[PDB]
Amino acid sequence: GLPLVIEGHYQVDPSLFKPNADFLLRVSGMSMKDIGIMDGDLLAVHKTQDVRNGQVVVARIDDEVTVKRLKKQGNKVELLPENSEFKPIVVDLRQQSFTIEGLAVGVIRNG
Amino acid sequence: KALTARQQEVFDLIRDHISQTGMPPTRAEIAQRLGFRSPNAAEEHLKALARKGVIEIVSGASRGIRLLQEEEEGLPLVGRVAADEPLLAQQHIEGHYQVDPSLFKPNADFLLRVSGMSMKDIGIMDGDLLAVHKTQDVRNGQVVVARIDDEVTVKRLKKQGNKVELLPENSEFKPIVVDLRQQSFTIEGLAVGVIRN
């Protein structure tokens, strides 16, 4: 049982993912298509703030959520795509609010 | 109820025979394949399986064995497939996942581990678990699960007369051309979704 964020609920064993999934999120756009995360996919997410460079994360940049690969160095935070047509996003912790919502641990596609 | 090691082997053979021919094995075939001393020996194990409710034995015509309690919750996962064995042979099943089959349309019957990056342009990656609806009724342009001389593959269908072309979704790959006049070919099912973990 996994909730979609509550907008819906799906009967998919949370323990099929490691770490375990806490919720699902609907993906918008093709910024992460090169690693198989497509528009309309449901992303399985483990709620946590402890992540590292190279992992795919869910971040909130001042009221907006995005799914990208992390590359952080101190106060400099880069959120990178997996699509050559997209620009990387750069954030400065000293100016705008930045929060890690979780770690991507899986995907469910049932269009 | 628990099946002994030998009872499990007899039950597995019965299920594999039905999956490959849709017909159960004879008592003689069971004794021969499992090296029993005689058909009487096979009958004893069959009596125990019926007693445990996994099968029904009907007196009369030959090959009178029927499976019971077939409906299962969730989906079985199929791994690497061996030559001369049906797709759902017991030796291919790695486990059972508790996933709602109705999340997919048409409904899923099983999951299949994907090998390689041939379909990465549409988001199907090496290691993904493909949700499959078992059927032989497919159409040009759909993504299907097929078997060429027993090798299983996931590609887009393009019928070509006495030949069949199976198309990839990756620039590094080229189509697989099957000549029906000299190669065995079968459609196993339709791809209806993906679970990546």
Side-chain angles (χ1 to χ4, degrees):
Chain A
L2 289 171
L4 177 173
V5 59
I6 292 67
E7 297 174 40
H9 205 76
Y10 300 89
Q11 308 313 301
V12 178
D13 188 1
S15 59
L16 295 179
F17 310 94
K18 292 302 188 64
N20 297 326
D22 294 301
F23 62 94
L24 296 164
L25 185 65
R26 179 77 61 177
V27 178
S28 172
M30 296 288 190
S31 65
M32 302 298 283
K33 67 164 57 179
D34 290 344
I35 58 168
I37 297 176
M38 326 295 272
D39 176 72
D41 281 359
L42 293 177
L43 188 76
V45 183
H46 174 70
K47 185 183 179 61
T48 182
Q49 292 191 71
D50 302 304
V51 292
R52 65 175 184 287
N53 292 178
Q55 295 187 305
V56 176
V57 307
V58 181
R60 173 180 289 191
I61 309 177
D62 289 327
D63 111 287
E64 298 187 62
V65 173
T66 194
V67 180
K68 298 288 180 297
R69 191 185 294 290
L70 179 71
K71 183 177 291 183
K72 176 181 179 302
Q73 282 284 298
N75 296 297
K76 174 183 179 59
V77 178
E78 302 178 64
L79 296 177
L80 307 168
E82 283 287 351
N83 186 325
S84 57
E85 290 186 58
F86 279 73
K87 289 184 169 186
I89 297 176
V90 181
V91 184
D92 190 301
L93 305 179
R94 306 164 180 175
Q95 310 296 173
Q96 47 212 306
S97 298
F98 177 96
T99 301
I100 291 295
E101 296 288 314
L103 175 68
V105 302
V107 172
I108 296 178
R109 180 179 308 135
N110 68 316
Chain B
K1 298 296 188 58
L3 302 188
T4 64
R6 186 145 294 187
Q7 288 164 186
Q8 183 77 235
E9 291 171 344
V10 175
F11 187 46
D12 289 343
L13 182 60
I14 292 170
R15 290 185 288 182
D16 294 347
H17 260 276
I18 296 180
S19 291
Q20 184 87 304
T21 70
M23 186 186 301
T26 60
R27 268 69 163 186
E29 286 172 343
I30 292 171
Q32 161 62 57
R33 192 68 186 281
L34 303 179
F36 293 163
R37 63 183 184 183
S38 63
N40 271 161
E43 187 69 12
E44 299 178 61
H45 295 294
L46 291 174
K47 283 184 163 68
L49 291 180
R51 199 155 54 212
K52 298 186 181 189
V54 303
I55 58 169
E56 171 174 50
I57 301 175
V58 304
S59 182
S62 62
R63 297 168 179 288
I65 295 179
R66 177 186 301 188
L67 304 173
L68 298 184
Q69 294 185 288
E70 291 190 277
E71 305 206 317
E72 310 284 298
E73 304 176 303
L75 306 165
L77 171 57
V78 180
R80 186 180 182 70
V81 182
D84 301 318
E85 296 287 354
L87 195 65
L88 294 184
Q90 298 306 129
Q91 68 202 65
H92 305 330
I93 312 297
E94 307 186 316
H96 287 263
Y97 282 39
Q98 296 317 72
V99 169
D100 180 4
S102 63
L103 298 175
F104 311 94
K105 193 63 182 182
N107 293 185
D109 292 300
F110 62 95
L111 293 163
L112 176 69
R113 174 171 291 116
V114 177
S115 169
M117 296 293 195
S118 72
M119 303 297 276
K120 71 172 302 184
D121 290 345
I122 58 174
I124 299 176
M125 324 294 285
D126 171 66
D128 284 356
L129 306 185
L130 190 70
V132 181
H133 176 78
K134 185 173 171 58
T135 185
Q136 259 65 300
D137 176 50
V138 297
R139 304 168 60 275
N140 283 146
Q142 288 184 143
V143 176
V144 307
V145 174
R147 198 163 186 176
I148 306 166
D149 283 326
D150 290 46
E151 288 199 11
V152 177
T153 199
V154 180
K155 300 288 175 296
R156 198 179 294 285
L157 184 67
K158 183 181 177 176
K159 295 175 290 186
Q160 290 285 80
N162 294 155
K163 292 188 176 181
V164 176
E165 290 184 356
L166 300 172
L167 283 29
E169 291 282 0
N170 181 321
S171 290
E172 289 178 70
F173 291 65
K174 60 189 180 67
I176 293 175
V177 184
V178 181
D179 187 341
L180 302 175
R181 297 167 303 173
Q182 35 178 288
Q183 302 180 80
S184 52
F185 177 89
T186 64
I187 294 302
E188 298 300 306
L190 173 76
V192 302
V194 170
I195 293 181
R196 178 179 307 133
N197 65 339

